[PDB]
Ligand binder design. Structure first.
Ligand SMILES: CC(=O)N[C@@H]1[C@@H](O)[C@H](O[C@@H]2O[C@H](CO)[C@H](O)[C@H](O[C@]3(C(=O)O)C[C@H](O)[C@@H](NC(C)=O)[C@H]([C@H](O)[C@H](O)CO)O3)[C@H]2O)[C@@H](CO)O[C@H]1O
Ligand SMILES: CC(=O)N[C@@H]1[C@@H](O)[C@H](O[C@@H]2O[C@H](CO)[C@H](O)[C@H](O[C@]3(C(=O)O)C[C@H](O)[C@@H](NC(C)=O)[C@H]([C@H](O)[C@H](O)CO)O3)[C@H]2O)[C@@H](CO)O[C@H]1O
Ligand SMILES: CC(=O)N[C@@H]1[C@@H](O)[C@H](O[C@@H]2O[C@H](CO)[C@H](O)[C@H](O[C@]3(C(=O)O)C[C@H](O)[C@@H](NC(C)=O)[C@H]([C@H](O)[C@H](O)CO)O3)[C@H]2O)[C@@H](CO)O[C@H]1O
Ligand SMILES: *[C@@H]1O[C@H](CO)[C@@H](O[C@@H]2O[C@H](CO)[C@@H](O)[C@H](O)[C@H]2NC(C)=O)[C@H](O)[C@H]1NC(C)=O
Ligand SMILES: *[C@@H]1O[C@H](CO)[C@@H](O[C@@H]2O[C@H](CO)[C@@H](O)[C@H](O)[C@H]2NC(C)=O)[C@H](O)[C@H]1NC(C)=O
Ligand SMILES: *[C@@H]1O[C@H](CO)[C@@H](O[C@@H]2O[C@H](CO)[C@@H](O)[C@H](O)[C@H]2NC(C)=O)[C@H](O)[C@H]1NC(C)=O
Ligand SMILES: *[C@@H]1O[C@H](CO)[C@@H](O[C@@H]2O[C@H](CO)[C@@H](O)[C@H](O)[C@H]2NC(C)=O)[C@H](O)[C@H]1NC(C)=O
Ligand SMILES: *[C@@H]1O[C@H](CO)[C@@H](O[C@@H]2O[C@H](CO)[C@@H](O)[C@H](O)[C@H]2NC(C)=O)[C@H](O)[C@H]1NC(C)=O
Ligand SMILES: *[C@@H]1O[C@H](CO)[C@@H](O[C@@H]2O[C@H](CO)[C@@H](O)[C@H](O)[C@H]2NC(C)=O)[C@H](O)[C@H]1NC(C)=O
Ligand SMILES: *[C@H]1O[C@H](CO)[C@@H](O[C@@H]2O[C@H](CO)[C@@H](O)[C@H](O)[C@H]2NC(C)=O)[C@H](O)[C@H]1NC(C)=O
Ligand SMILES: *[C@H]1O[C@H](CO)[C@@H](O[C@@H]2O[C@H](CO)[C@@H](O)[C@H](O)[C@H]2NC(C)=O)[C@H](O)[C@H]1NC(C)=O
Ligand SMILES: *[C@H]1O[C@H](CO)[C@@H](O[C@@H]2O[C@H](CO)[C@@H](O)[C@H](O)[C@H]2NC(C)=O)[C@H](O)[C@H]1NC(C)=O
Lengths: 162, 321, 321, 162, 321, 162
């Protein structure tokens, strides 16, 4: 993807994280686990919902065909009428399939962007207090219990402390 | 000790297309195209469609004898007519401005039939021998029920001078016709007079028909032809007929009580004994989807028609192996 | 000591929509939709529209007596006609191929009226008693000014045989008519002869009209009807009339001097005593915007019509609280 | 936004920077202030101008309705004509609103991208000679007077010197 | 020691446009618009177009004497007609429902001409003096070859009563006409009887024409007019003519052997002695491109027409100075 | 560009790299040279091919004009017919030029994204074992022969070794 996170430096998703789209996995002396980041997740749910609604509404007003009948010596206008109706269906079919194609691509990259931004957000807190492993993980130089892990998810990781 | 950033995965197989890549598997998605219908013609908002079955708008409105089902039909939501209904113009001919009339019906939900000229009233002409073998009812030669085929009495067709005033609040659909005879002998035989005409007049209408004689291939066992005309008589306007032969007079004319949204749907299908909020010529639709691909011509509160086979939006992210 | 990277903010409240988020506040933006008009019909490029007011294209071109304002009207930019102009066909009837003619006018900016057959010239027929109470001028029965309603003189209508040759460089719009009488007595009374016709001929035209008699509801106090026909006579072509009754002859016919961009705008509005470069049926437009949403039918150098209520482009960035 | 800078790791814009869209804020012993980055700013002004013009011109050639009139027994073609005109208006209305929606979204992300790229540009100069604070700021390990600050905006920050 | 990440550059000058920037130079690109054509009308899939040259669909189908090239023309892929072909209706007149007929031809690839009424067969009328100076062949007055202009013999025009039954499996295109004389003397002179008619009848058709007399500008040296009519006679249907004057009878009528995709292309161009898979009125097209901008009206397997001057897709990346 | 790599922190392309779109240039005691990264390159070739085909196919079903003729007193429908045909050509012309414009822009940024992602991929391997020069290059703290360079292109650079 465009942002390099999803199926990128972070190789794969987590079957074990069911409470959200993006989050953290910690592991220390006292155990390990998954925790969804609510803020980024909710942001994504809002983005995509609006998108789906935006798409549905833009297509709302669109061509509608009516039955019109023509006798045996009105073949030109019968034909004209058919082309007109067919023409608009083709135009609106194209509009729909393109929109879906284009926005689908934007949606995947959007998720990729949110994962990366979350990663950078964490990276910028830890700074030189942890090793960047290259895979989405940071290995701490100091013991980091559940309180410590919580502060990283908090946004509260006290860098001058460690 | 470490903390990792990652993203959701699941067992979903749903796939979406993008511009650069097809069949991408995603955790979540949303189908927005309705691909199914019940396969039946249905009531629309509880209101039954007028189903002509084998009859045609012409058969119905002139009152073909085999379209007896459709006398005084109630209010309809939409009308359903086959592609080649057998019971059309039983006595061969033409229906003048037929398509413009059919178009008028797309704005109409209910007719109320009323008698403007009684059959009894034709005292100076014979009004009950006006039938043909082409339009047969119950084994006996009959004719379009809504119009009277007037012929001569005691070898004489005196000039007809008749006038109806529309005192109803409604627009009135008046129907009439002219008969084209096979030959000069046939003309004299039926109507006595050799040179005839029908002058019709309203506030707008200024018609005068004459019979065209020609030798024609038999259709439905007859080489003679009936050309049918119509008008909308406005309220408080009067229509004026005058003829000395070949006049097919109105008996009943239709009152236009309800105007509104309707359509002439074209389907071979019959009634399904069902109800819907959205109908197509192939069957009814029930969905919340913004799109469908069943058939372009629909009536009711429907999704938008597209020729797509598949429309699926990614909501979730790229799902992992 | 530190250096920071940041971005602009300001006190702007302007909002733009995107696909995922609505009402986003931005530092700068650009509205591209024109939402306002002056509310007036206006001169176009300084050139006055032809405003018919209560008259109609028919009233004007036949020369209805109450459309006297519109004799020899100057060059126009566009024409303005009401939805239901009162001064139309004062003597009831039809105007044949009226819409095709109106369409022709969308290509015309100026007519120059000229007399092809003088009223004086009808020596063998009465030319000055051809009037009706339906078209009244100054309390006195008058008639369409551009055509002469010829009647019999000393109980005789001799065959009319008249011919005009278009020696002008221009195309000529010629107008004429046929009168349909109420009854046989009325026909003989007006024209003596019972069976009549009007043969018209040019290089292309091959017409022959006959009067249709019928009993009709009075319109404007008359049950008789006038059906009006037209042609474009090419330069160096001649038109040939011949009739033995019921002939409404041309007096004046219109010369087509300027052809070009024009339109028949439909508005109830009157003249605003203003000028514009872009006109709509609701008012004129003055803007640099690429779009507007005033009304689809416009004339002049205009932005493109859209049904949008709002079109606003982000130029700046997302503005902060 | 997609790039994580605007309303991201850089929390908010600056009312105090009026000379441009993107720039630097310095603070040292001798005072503090705002300085717009002209290069990135001008790049943005060009991008967006072209966009607006590109949008205006693509819409240039678009359907135009004409008055056409039909008598009482030409209802089918009157209707056909109406549907045709309505159909094209709907198509062009949709084209306009979608374009604006889609490009508006692209414009905001474009600005976000320019802020991030400028940030990275500075980050890559300073390298390990300054602390990355996590908020758009770099705190220097060495005193950095106005000359020094100027060299960072220059592109000229002499890393081997400090 | 160091390792660097970088990207491809090359000597390409190709440029592509984007929304924010124009004329961007890229390493690789792909043109998708076909801008060239051979400049010639060509065979289509090896099948020659029917090229009328100076003749017109009317000239051809009535059998204008100067359209002798086009008797029994073979199967065609498409037809080519000029904008103002000189050899049209040599004897002035009209061709009724001409455009509806031309439209019918867009569905036809081959006619097979056959004789339904032999010229010899008109024993009671003169069939070989029916010619005019307006349609001249080899310096001698001739006439539309496919129809016989019948006149009186020994001062008498007895009623014609003729009937053709379509025993062929095909639809048959039958053509005929009526002659409009200059004056009453001309009518009697040519046909003896003063009041005449032509009744035509099939299973559907119910025609009866009468000659309209009028004084007309000479066209091609004649003031008289010929109005031509047509029908499609279905298989096993019969057509029935009856007339007492002014009848232009069918000699030959066209059998419709192949129906399918075709078109009436409008071009001044002549045959190029070439072949193509896609033809336009300006020349033929040979490309793999998905689009072209040559001309909208094409026939065959063609790219999609666009009004674009340039369509170029970036494939590679932004190329460096 | 959006991602900051192409004509960004990496100032220019390489005439010397002909075997691919993206790759590595190494230089050490034993010589220097260009090596294309096949994985990223092939990914790009697939992306762009599909794009071109996707574009060609969406345009596949599009309005087609037919010859229809009208006599001298059918000017209204002649005009209607002309407007209808012109209208659809304009709509499809617009569709084509916009698509090309929009996707062209997406294609360039796509290449930019792939270069950056490749750069980050390498950066994340080397970590603190090399200096980030600011121009697309990493200067090693240890001698890095062809074996060593190969391991960086491999994805195999053994960080704990050096
Ligand atoms: C080859 C031959 O001699 N055949 C005749 C055969 O024609 C004839 O049958 C009658 O033929 C006439 C015209 O030729 C009509 O077709 C008669 O049909 C009817 C009809 O059913 O419509 C009878 C009906 O009673 C008539 N009704 C009225 C109101 O007139 C109508 C009507 O006149 C015509 O349809 C008007 O066009 O015609 C049909 O019986 C038979 C018996 O006479 O003898 C054959 O030898
Ligand atoms: C119930 C009754 O007896 N009513 C008559 C009433 O008709 C009649 O008025 C005259 O009626 C005739 C036809 O019936 C016309 O309507 C007369 O109107 C005019 C008109 O103004 O158009 C008079 C005009 O001078 C006539 N002009 C010409 C050139 O002919 C025209 C014209 O003939 C017709 O319009 C052609 O259709 O008619 C109207 O005065 C009155 C007085 O006669 O007596 C009532 O009892
Ligand atoms: C001013 C003057 O006196 N002029 C006459 C001049 O008319 C006349 O020429 C003949 O004129 C008649 C009608 O006026 C026809 O135009 C004759 O042309 C033909 C034709 O070629 O079509 C001759 C032809 O043989 C006729 N064929 C038939 C089947 O009738 C036709 C035909 O009758 C008409 O076209 C039907 O409308 O007309 C033309 O020769 C000359 C010599 O008579 O004398 C001049 O003084
Ligand atoms: C994407 O998946 C679809 C549907 O699963 C594939 O569609 C099938 O295509 C093959 C041949 O390409 C056929 O045998 C099937 O009949 C198709 N079924 C469909 C379209 O419903 C499609 O091939 C895949 N597309 C790509 C590009 O991989
Ligand atoms: C049809 O009948 C109605 C009423 O029966 C006519 O309307 C009235 O006409 C009379 C007759 O002169 C007038 O005095 C009244 O003012 C009208 N009243 C109403 C309620 O309509 C109507 O004119 C008749 N129509 C025609 C065409 O003769
Ligand atoms: C975005 O702002 C618009 C305009 O300020 C809001 O429009 C109003 O919507 C509310 C109800 O939703 C109504 O009471 C007003 O009459 C609307 N005025 C308009 C549309 O001009 C709109 O609600 C906002 N949209 C969203 C999604 O927040
Ligand atoms: C209408 O009049 C013009 C000129 O008055 C006619 O044109 C001339 O016709 C004469 C008469 O035979 C020819 O000799 C000339 O060659 C023509 N000259 C010009 C300048 O037109 C015209 O033919 C007349 N039209 C008709 C239909 O009779
Ligand atoms: C992009 O390049 C095109 C074609 O090389 C330029 O087109 C020329 O424009 C100039 C004036 O702007 C004219 O003198 C030429 O006749 C044009 N030729 C064309 C369009 O084929 C165009 O100017 C450049 N556009 C921009 C925005 O720089
Ligand atoms: C035209 O001719 C065909 C055959 O020559 C007619 O068809 C036959 O008509 C006879 C006559 O009554 C019937 O007995 C047969 O059943 C028909 N056979 C075939 C093969 O068609 C046809 O009816 C004639 N058409 C008309 C209108 O009279
Ligand atoms: C996030 O978590 C941190 C540490 O896990 C929180 O700090 C603790 O908060 C609890 C609950 O109020 C207190 O009882 C402890 O005394 C705090 N310990 C430490 C080490 O801080 C902090 O409150 C949380 N911050 C936010 C913004 O939610
Ligand atoms: C950017 O600024 C640096 C330092 O602020 C400039 O270097 C100084 O330039 C001035 C003006 O020419 C000289 O008088 C000084 O001697 C220089 N001092 C230092 C420390 O470099 C440099 O010229 C500027 N660079 C650019 C590209 O504008
Ligand atoms: C990539 O290259 C590395 C080092 O250049 C490879 O390691 C060598 O592989 C060769 C060939 O099999 C062996 O003979 C050597 O013994 C290995 N040396 C070292 C230092 O590793 C490695 O095989 C390659 N890895 C991949 C995934 O291709």
């Amino acid at each position: 993807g465009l942002f390099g996170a999803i199926a990128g430096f972070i190789e794969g998703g987590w079957q074990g994280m069911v409470d959200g789209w993006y989050g953290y996995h910690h592991s220390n002396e006292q155990g390990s686990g998954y925790a969804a980041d609510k803020e980024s997740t909710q942001k994504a749910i809002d983005g995509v919902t609006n998108k789906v609604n935006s798409i549905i509404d833009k297509m709302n007003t669109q061509f509608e065909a009516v039955g019109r009948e023509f006798n045996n010596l009105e073949r030109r206008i019968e034909n004209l009428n058919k082309k007109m109706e067919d023409g608009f269906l083709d135009v609106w079919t194209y509009n729909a399939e393109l929109l879906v194609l284009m926005e689908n691509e934007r949606t995947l990259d959007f998720h990729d962007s949110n994962v990366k931004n979350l990663y950078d957000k964490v990276r910028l807190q830890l700074r030189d207090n942890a090793k960047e492993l290259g895979n989405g993980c940071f290995e701490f130089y100091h013991k980091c219990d559940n309180e410590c892990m919580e502060s990283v998810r908090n946004g509260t990781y006290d860098y001058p402390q460690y | 000790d470490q903390i990792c950033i990652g993203y959701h995965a699941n067992n979903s197989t749903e796939q979406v297309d993008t511009i650069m890549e097809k069949n991408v598997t995603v955790t979540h998605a949303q189908d927005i195209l309705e691909k199914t219908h019940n396969g039946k013609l249905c009531d629309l908002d509880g209101v039954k469609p007028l189903i002509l079955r084998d009859c045609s708008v012409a058969g119905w409105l002139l009152g073909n004898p085999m379209c007896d089902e459709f006398i005084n039909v109630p209010e309809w939501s939409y009308i359903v007519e086959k592609a080649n209904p057998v019971n059309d113009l039983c006595y061969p001919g033409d229906f003048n401005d037929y398509e413009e009339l059919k178009h008028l019906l797309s704005r109409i939900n209910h007719f109320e039939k009323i008698q403007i000229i009684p059959k009894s009233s034709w005292s100076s002409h014979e009004a009950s021998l006006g039938v043909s073998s082409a339009c047969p009812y119950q084994g006996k030669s009959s004719f379009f029920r809504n119009v009277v085929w007037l012929i001569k009495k005691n070898s004489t067709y005196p000039t007809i001078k008749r006038s109806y005033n529309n005192t109803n609040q409604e627009d009135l659909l008046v129907l009439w016709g002219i008969h084209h005879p096979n030959d000069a002998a046939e003309q004299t035989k039926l109507y006595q007079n050799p040179t005839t005409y029908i002058s019709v007049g309203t506030s707008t209408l200024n018609q005068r028909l004459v019979p065209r004689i020609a030798t024609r291939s038999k259709v439905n066992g007859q080489s003679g032809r009936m050309e049918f005309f119509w008008t909308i008589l406005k309220p408080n306007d009067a229509i004026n007929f005058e003829s000395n032969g070949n006049f097919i007079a109105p008996e009943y004319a239709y009152k236009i009580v309800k105007k509104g949204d309707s359509t002439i749907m074209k389907s071979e299908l019959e009634y399904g004994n069902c109800n819907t909020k959205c109908q197509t010529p192939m069957g009814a639709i029930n969905s919340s989807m913004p799109f469908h691909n069943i058939h372009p011509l629909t009536i009711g509160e429907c999704p938008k028609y597209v020729k797509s086979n598949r429309l699926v939006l990614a909501t979730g992210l790229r799902n992992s192996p």
